[PDB]
Amino acid sequence: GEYFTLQIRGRERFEMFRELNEALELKDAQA
Amino acid sequence: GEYFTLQIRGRERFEMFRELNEALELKDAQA
Amino acid sequence: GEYFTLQIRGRERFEMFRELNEALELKDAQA
Amino acid sequence: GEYFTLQIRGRERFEMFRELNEALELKDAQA
């Protein structure tokens, strides 16, 4: 369990990955 | 709100997308 | 190497995964 | 066109996003 940084270039593509990470984070917030 | 099919070639890559869809689906199952 | 189907519900989210698959497919088209 | 950082927790999940970003980056390297 470690923390990694994902620096991507652009703006819209970064939002796509942000959505996939938004649901995963929701898993940790499944209370 | 419609249903779309994503047919990908390979096997491991398909699992990656499956994980991103596993959390999104978890959002719908946030009960 | 097999073919799998990824049926997702919604419309915008499907586009996100479509982009990640658009680049991967571009890898196979790296000629 | 800007640069954003995606800090995710874990280790395997970060690899998944790294793959989707590996192909996108390959698009910029389509020479």
Coordinates of N, CA, C and O in Angstrom, one line a residue:
Chain A
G1 N 0.9 -1.2 0.0 CA 0.0 0.0 0.0 C 0.9 1.2 0.0 O 1.4 1.7 1.0
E2 N 1.1 1.8 -1.1 CA 1.9 3.1 -1.2 C 1.2 4.2 -2.0 O 0.1 3.9 -2.5
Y3 N 1.8 5.3 -2.1 CA 1.1 6.4 -2.8 C 1.9 6.8 -4.1 O 3.1 7.0 -4.0
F4 N 1.3 6.8 -5.2 CA 2.1 7.2 -6.5 C 1.4 8.4 -7.1 O 0.3 8.7 -6.9
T5 N 2.2 9.1 -7.9 CA 1.7 10.3 -8.6 C 1.5 10.0 -10.1 O 2.4 9.5 -10.7
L6 N 0.4 10.5 -10.6 CA 0.2 10.2 -12.1 C 0.1 11.6 -12.8 O -0.9 12.1 -13.0
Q7 N 1.2 12.1 -13.2 CA 1.2 13.4 -13.9 C 0.9 13.2 -15.4 O 1.7 12.6 -16.2
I8 N -0.3 13.6 -15.9 CA -0.6 13.5 -17.3 C -0.7 14.8 -18.0 O -1.0 15.8 -17.4
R9 N -0.4 14.9 -19.3 CA -0.4 16.2 -20.0 C -1.8 16.3 -20.7 O -2.4 15.3 -21.0
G10 N -2.3 17.5 -20.8 CA -3.6 17.7 -21.5 C -4.6 18.3 -20.4 O -4.2 19.0 -19.5
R11 N -5.9 17.9 -20.5 CA -6.9 18.4 -19.6 C -8.1 17.5 -19.5 O -8.5 17.1 -18.5
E12 N -8.6 17.2 -20.7 CA -9.8 16.3 -20.7 C -9.4 14.9 -20.3 O -10.0 14.2 -19.5
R13 N -8.3 14.4 -20.9 CA -7.9 13.0 -20.6 C -7.7 12.9 -19.1 O -8.1 11.9 -18.5
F14 N -7.1 13.9 -18.5 CA -6.9 13.8 -17.0 C -8.2 13.6 -16.3 O -8.4 12.9 -15.3
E15 N -9.3 14.2 -16.8 CA -10.6 14.1 -16.2 C -11.1 12.6 -16.3 O -11.6 12.1 -15.4
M16 N -10.8 12.0 -17.4 CA -11.2 10.6 -17.6 C -10.6 9.8 -16.5 O -11.3 9.1 -15.7
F17 N -9.3 9.8 -16.3 CA -8.7 9.0 -15.2 C -9.2 9.5 -13.9 O -9.4 8.7 -13.0
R18 N -9.6 10.7 -13.8 CA -10.1 11.2 -12.5 C -11.4 10.5 -12.2 O -11.8 10.2 -11.0
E19 N -12.2 10.2 -13.2 CA -13.5 9.5 -13.0 C -13.2 8.1 -12.5 O -13.8 7.6 -11.5
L20 N -12.3 7.4 -13.2 CA -12.0 6.0 -12.7 C -11.5 6.0 -11.3 O -11.7 5.1 -10.5
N21 N -10.8 7.1 -10.9 CA -10.3 7.2 -9.6 C -11.4 7.7 -8.6 O -11.3 7.5 -7.4
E22 N -12.4 8.3 -9.2 CA -13.5 8.8 -8.4 C -14.3 7.7 -7.8 O -14.8 7.7 -6.7
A23 N -14.5 6.7 -8.7 CA -15.3 5.5 -8.2 C -14.5 4.7 -7.3 O -14.9 4.3 -6.2
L24 N -13.2 4.4 -7.6 CA -12.3 3.6 -6.7 C -12.3 4.3 -5.4 O -12.5 3.6 -4.3
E25 N -12.2 5.5 -5.3 CA -12.2 6.3 -4.0 C -13.5 6.0 -3.4 O -13.7 5.9 -2.1
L26 N -14.6 6.0 -4.1 CA -15.9 5.8 -3.6 C -15.9 4.4 -2.9 O -16.6 4.2 -1.9
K27 N -15.2 3.5 -3.4 CA -15.1 2.1 -2.7 C -14.6 2.3 -1.3 O -15.2 1.7 -0.4
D28 N -13.6 3.1 -1.1 CA -13.0 3.3 0.2 C -14.0 4.1 1.0 O -14.0 4.1 2.3
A29 N -15.0 4.7 0.4 CA -16.0 5.5 1.1 C -17.3 4.8 1.1 O -18.4 5.3 1.1
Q30 N -17.3 3.5 1.0 CA -18.5 2.7 1.0 C -19.0 2.4 2.4 O -19.2 1.3 2.9
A31 N -19.3 3.5 3.1 CA -19.8 3.4 4.5 C -21.3 3.6 4.6 O -22.0 3.2 5.5
Chain B
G1 N -29.1 7.5 -20.9 CA -28.8 6.2 -20.2 C -29.0 5.1 -21.2 O -30.1 4.6 -21.4
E2 N -27.9 4.6 -21.8 CA -28.0 3.5 -22.7 C -27.0 2.4 -22.4 O -26.2 2.6 -21.5
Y3 N -27.0 1.3 -23.1 CA -26.0 0.2 -22.8 C -25.1 0.1 -24.0 O -25.5 0.0 -25.1
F4 N -23.8 0.1 -23.8 CA -22.8 -0.1 -24.9 C -21.9 -1.3 -24.6 O -21.7 -1.6 -23.5
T5 N -21.4 -1.8 -25.7 CA -20.5 -3.0 -25.5 C -19.0 -2.6 -25.8 O -18.7 -1.9 -26.8
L6 N -18.1 -3.0 -25.0 CA -16.7 -2.6 -25.2 C -15.9 -3.9 -25.5 O -15.4 -4.6 -24.5
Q7 N -15.7 -4.3 -26.7 CA -15.0 -5.6 -27.0 C -13.5 -5.2 -27.2 O -13.1 -4.6 -28.1
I8 N -12.7 -5.7 -26.3 CA -11.2 -5.4 -26.4 C -10.5 -6.7 -26.7 O -10.9 -7.8 -26.2
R9 N -9.4 -6.6 -27.3 CA -8.5 -7.8 -27.6 C -7.5 -7.9 -26.6 O -7.0 -7.0 -26.0
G10 N -7.1 -9.2 -26.3 CA -6.1 -9.4 -25.2 C -6.7 -10.1 -24.0 O -7.6 -10.9 -24.2
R11 N -6.2 -9.8 -22.8 CA -6.8 -10.5 -21.7 C -6.5 -9.7 -20.4 O -7.3 -9.5 -19.6
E12 N -5.2 -9.3 -20.2 CA -4.9 -8.5 -19.0 C -5.5 -7.1 -19.2 O -6.1 -6.6 -18.2
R13 N -5.3 -6.5 -20.3 CA -5.9 -5.1 -20.5 C -7.4 -5.1 -20.2 O -7.9 -4.3 -19.5
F14 N -8.1 -6.1 -20.6 CA -9.5 -6.2 -20.4 C -9.8 -6.2 -18.9 O -10.7 -5.6 -18.4
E15 N -8.9 -6.8 -18.1 CA -9.1 -6.8 -16.6 C -8.9 -5.4 -16.1 O -9.6 -5.0 -15.2
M16 N -8.0 -4.7 -16.6 CA -7.8 -3.3 -16.2 C -9.1 -2.5 -16.3 O -9.6 -2.0 -15.3
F17 N -9.7 -2.5 -17.4 CA -11.0 -1.8 -17.6 C -12.0 -2.4 -16.7 O -12.9 -1.7 -16.2
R18 N -12.0 -3.7 -16.5 CA -13.0 -4.3 -15.7 C -12.9 -3.8 -14.3 O -13.9 -3.6 -13.6
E19 N -11.7 -3.4 -13.8 CA -11.5 -2.9 -12.4 C -12.2 -1.5 -12.4 O -13.0 -1.2 -11.5
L20 N -11.9 -0.6 -13.4 CA -12.5 0.7 -13.4 C -14.0 0.6 -13.4 O -14.7 1.4 -12.8
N21 N -14.5 -0.4 -14.1 CA -16.0 -0.6 -14.2 C -16.5 -1.3 -12.9 O -17.6 -1.3 -12.6
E22 N -15.6 -2.0 -12.2 CA -16.0 -2.7 -10.9 C -16.3 -1.6 -9.9 O -17.2 -1.8 -9.1
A23 N -15.5 -0.5 -9.8 CA -15.8 0.5 -8.8 C -17.0 1.3 -9.3 O -17.9 1.6 -8.5
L24 N -17.1 1.7 -10.5 CA -18.3 2.5 -11.0 C -19.5 1.7 -10.6 O -20.5 2.2 -10.1
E25 N -19.5 0.4 -10.9 CA -20.7 -0.5 -10.6 C -20.9 -0.4 -9.1 O -22.0 -0.5 -8.6
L26 N -19.8 -0.3 -8.3 CA -19.9 -0.3 -6.8 C -20.7 1.0 -6.5 O -21.4 1.1 -5.5
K27 N -20.5 2.0 -7.3 CA -21.2 3.3 -7.0 C -22.7 3.0 -7.0 O -23.5 3.5 -6.2
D28 N -23.1 2.3 -8.0 CA -24.6 2.0 -8.2 C -25.0 1.1 -7.0 O -26.2 1.0 -6.7
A29 N -24.0 0.4 -6.5 CA -24.4 -0.5 -5.3 C -24.0 0.2 -4.0 O -23.6 -0.5 -3.1
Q30 N -24.0 1.4 -3.9 CA -23.7 2.1 -2.7 C -24.9 2.2 -1.7 O -25.4 3.2 -1.3
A31 N -25.4 1.0 -1.3 CA -26.5 1.0 -0.4 C -26.1 0.6 1.0 O -26.8 0.8 1.9
Chain C
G1 N -4.4 -14.6 -25.6 CA -5.0 -13.5 -26.4 C -6.4 -13.9 -26.8 O -6.7 -14.7 -27.7
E2 N -7.4 -13.3 -26.1 CA -8.8 -13.7 -26.4 C -9.6 -12.4 -26.5 O -9.1 -11.3 -26.3
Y3 N -10.8 -12.5 -26.9 CA -11.7 -11.3 -27.0 C -12.7 -11.2 -25.9 O -13.4 -12.2 -25.7
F4 N -12.9 -10.1 -25.2 CA -13.9 -10.0 -24.1 C -14.8 -8.9 -24.4 O -14.5 -7.9 -25.1
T5 N -16.0 -8.9 -23.9 CA -17.0 -7.8 -24.1 C -17.1 -7.0 -22.8 O -17.2 -7.6 -21.7
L6 N -17.2 -5.7 -22.9 CA -17.4 -4.9 -21.7 C -18.7 -4.1 -21.8 O -18.7 -2.9 -22.2
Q7 N -19.8 -4.6 -21.4 CA -21.0 -3.9 -21.5 C -21.2 -3.0 -20.3 O -21.3 -3.4 -19.1
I8 N -21.2 -1.7 -20.5 CA -21.3 -0.7 -19.3 C -22.6 0.1 -19.5 O -23.1 0.3 -20.6
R9 N -23.2 0.5 -18.4 CA -24.5 1.2 -18.5 C -24.1 2.7 -18.4 O -23.2 3.1 -17.8
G10 N -24.9 3.5 -19.1 CA -24.7 5.0 -19.1 C -24.4 5.4 -20.5 O -24.9 4.9 -21.5
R11 N -23.5 6.4 -20.6 CA -23.2 6.9 -22.0 C -21.8 7.6 -22.0 O -21.0 7.4 -22.8
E12 N -21.7 8.6 -21.1 CA -20.4 9.3 -21.0 C -19.3 8.4 -20.4 O -18.2 8.3 -21.0
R13 N -19.6 7.7 -19.4 CA -18.5 6.8 -18.8 C -18.0 5.8 -19.9 O -16.9 5.6 -20.1
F14 N -18.9 5.3 -20.7 CA -18.5 4.4 -21.8 C -17.5 5.1 -22.7 O -16.6 4.5 -23.3
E15 N -17.7 6.4 -22.9 CA -16.8 7.1 -23.8 C -15.4 7.2 -23.1 O -14.4 7.0 -23.8
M16 N -15.3 7.3 -21.8 CA -14.0 7.4 -21.1 C -13.3 6.1 -21.4 O -12.2 6.1 -22.0
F17 N -13.9 5.0 -21.1 CA -13.2 3.7 -21.4 C -12.9 3.6 -22.9 O -11.9 3.0 -23.3
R18 N -13.7 4.1 -23.7 CA -13.5 4.1 -25.2 C -12.2 4.8 -25.5 O -11.4 4.4 -26.4
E19 N -11.9 5.9 -24.8 CA -10.6 6.6 -25.1 C -9.4 5.8 -24.7 O -8.5 5.6 -25.4
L20 N -9.5 5.2 -23.5 CA -8.3 4.4 -23.0 C -8.1 3.2 -24.0 O -7.0 2.8 -24.3
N21 N -9.2 2.8 -24.6 CA -9.1 1.7 -25.6 C -8.7 2.3 -27.0 O -8.2 1.6 -27.9
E22 N -9.0 3.5 -27.2 CA -8.6 4.2 -28.5 C -7.1 4.3 -28.6 O -6.5 4.1 -29.6
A23 N -6.4 4.6 -27.5 CA -5.0 4.7 -27.5 C -4.4 3.3 -27.6 O -3.5 3.0 -28.4
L24 N -4.8 2.4 -26.8 CA -4.3 1.0 -26.8 C -4.4 0.5 -28.3 O -3.5 -0.1 -28.8
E25 N -5.5 0.7 -28.9 CA -5.7 0.2 -30.3 C -4.7 1.0 -31.1 O -4.2 0.4 -32.1
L26 N -4.4 2.2 -30.8 CA -3.4 3.0 -31.6 C -2.1 2.3 -31.5 O -1.3 2.3 -32.4
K27 N -1.8 1.6 -30.4 CA -0.5 0.9 -30.2 C -0.4 -0.2 -31.3 O 0.6 -0.4 -31.9
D28 N -1.5 -0.9 -31.4 CA -1.5 -2.0 -32.5 C -1.4 -1.4 -33.9 O -1.0 -2.0 -34.8
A29 N -1.8 -0.1 -34.0 CA -1.7 0.6 -35.3 C -0.5 1.5 -35.3 O -0.5 2.5 -35.9
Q30 N 0.6 1.1 -34.6 CA 1.8 2.0 -34.6 C 2.7 1.6 -35.8 O 3.8 1.2 -35.7
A31 N 2.2 1.8 -37.0 CA 3.0 1.5 -38.2 C 3.4 2.8 -38.8 O 4.4 2.7 -39.6
Chain D
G1 N -4.3 22.9 -22.7 CA -3.2 21.9 -22.5 C -2.5 22.3 -21.2 O -1.6 23.1 -21.1
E2 N -2.8 21.6 -20.1 CA -2.1 21.8 -18.8 C -1.6 20.5 -18.3 O -1.8 19.4 -18.8
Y3 N -0.9 20.6 -17.2 CA -0.4 19.3 -16.5 C -1.1 19.1 -15.2 O -1.1 20.0 -14.4
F4 N -1.6 17.9 -15.0 CA -2.3 17.7 -13.7 C -1.6 16.5 -13.0 O -1.0 15.6 -13.6
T5 N -1.7 16.4 -11.7 CA -1.1 15.2 -10.9 C -2.2 14.3 -10.4 O -3.3 14.7 -9.9
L6 N -2.1 13.0 -10.6 CA -3.1 12.1 -10.1 C -2.5 11.2 -9.0 O -2.0 10.1 -9.3
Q7 N -2.6 11.6 -7.8 CA -2.0 10.8 -6.7 C -3.1 9.7 -6.2 O -4.1 10.1 -5.7
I8 N -2.8 8.5 -6.5 CA -3.7 7.4 -6.1 C -3.1 6.6 -5.0 O -1.9 6.4 -4.9
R9 N -3.9 6.0 -4.1 CA -3.4 5.2 -3.0 C -3.4 3.7 -3.4 O -4.3 3.3 -4.2
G10 N -2.5 2.9 -2.9 CA -2.5 1.5 -3.3 C -1.2 1.2 -4.1 O -0.2 1.8 -3.9
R11 N -1.3 0.3 -5.1 CA -0.1 0.0 -5.9 C -0.5 -0.7 -7.2 O 0.0 -0.3 -8.2
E12 N -1.3 -1.7 -7.1 CA -1.8 -2.3 -8.4 C -2.7 -1.4 -9.2 O -2.5 -1.2 -10.4
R13 N -3.6 -0.8 -8.5 CA -4.6 0.1 -9.2 C -3.7 1.2 -9.9 O -4.0 1.5 -11.1
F14 N -2.8 1.7 -9.3 CA -1.9 2.8 -9.9 C -1.3 2.2 -11.2 O -1.2 2.9 -12.2
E15 N -1.0 1.0 -11.3 CA -0.4 0.4 -12.5 C -1.5 0.4 -13.6 O -1.2 0.6 -14.7
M16 N -2.7 0.1 -13.2 CA -3.8 0.1 -14.2 C -3.8 1.4 -14.9 O -3.7 1.5 -16.1
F17 N -4.0 2.5 -14.2 CA -4.0 3.8 -14.8 C -2.7 4.1 -15.6 O -2.7 4.8 -16.6
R18 N -1.7 3.5 -15.1 CA -0.4 3.8 -15.8 C -0.4 3.1 -17.2 O 0.2 3.6 -18.1
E19 N -1.1 2.0 -17.3 CA -1.2 1.4 -18.6 C -2.1 2.3 -19.6 O -1.7 2.6 -20.7
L20 N -3.2 2.7 -19.1 CA -4.1 3.6 -19.9 C -3.3 4.9 -20.3 O -3.4 5.4 -21.4
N21 N -2.4 5.3 -19.5 CA -1.6 6.5 -19.8 C -0.4 6.1 -20.6 O 0.2 6.9 -21.3
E22 N 0.0 4.8 -20.6 CA 1.1 4.3 -21.4 C 0.7 4.3 -22.8 O 1.5 4.7 -23.7
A23 N -0.5 4.0 -23.1 CA -0.9 4.0 -24.6 C -1.1 5.4 -25.0 O -0.7 5.8 -26.1
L24 N -1.8 6.2 -24.2 CA -2.0 7.6 -24.6 C -0.7 8.3 -24.9 O -0.5 8.9 -25.9
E25 N 0.3 8.1 -24.1 CA 1.6 8.6 -24.3 C 2.2 8.1 -25.6 O 2.8 8.7 -26.4
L26 N 1.8 6.8 -25.9 CA 2.3 6.2 -27.2 C 1.7 7.0 -28.3 O 2.3 7.1 -29.4
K27 N 0.6 7.5 -28.2 CA -0.1 8.3 -29.2 C 0.8 9.5 -29.6 O 1.1 9.8 -30.7
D28 N 1.3 10.2 -28.5 CA 2.2 11.4 -28.7 C 3.5 10.9 -29.3 O 4.3 11.6 -29.9
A29 N 3.8 9.6 -29.2 CA 5.1 9.1 -29.7 C 4.8 8.2 -31.0 O 5.4 7.3 -31.3
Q30 N 3.8 8.6 -31.7 CA 3.4 7.9 -32.9 C 4.2 8.4 -34.1 O 3.7 8.9 -35.1
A31 N 5.5 8.3 -34.0 CA 6.4 8.8 -35.1 C 6.9 7.6 -35.9 O 7.4 7.8 -37.0

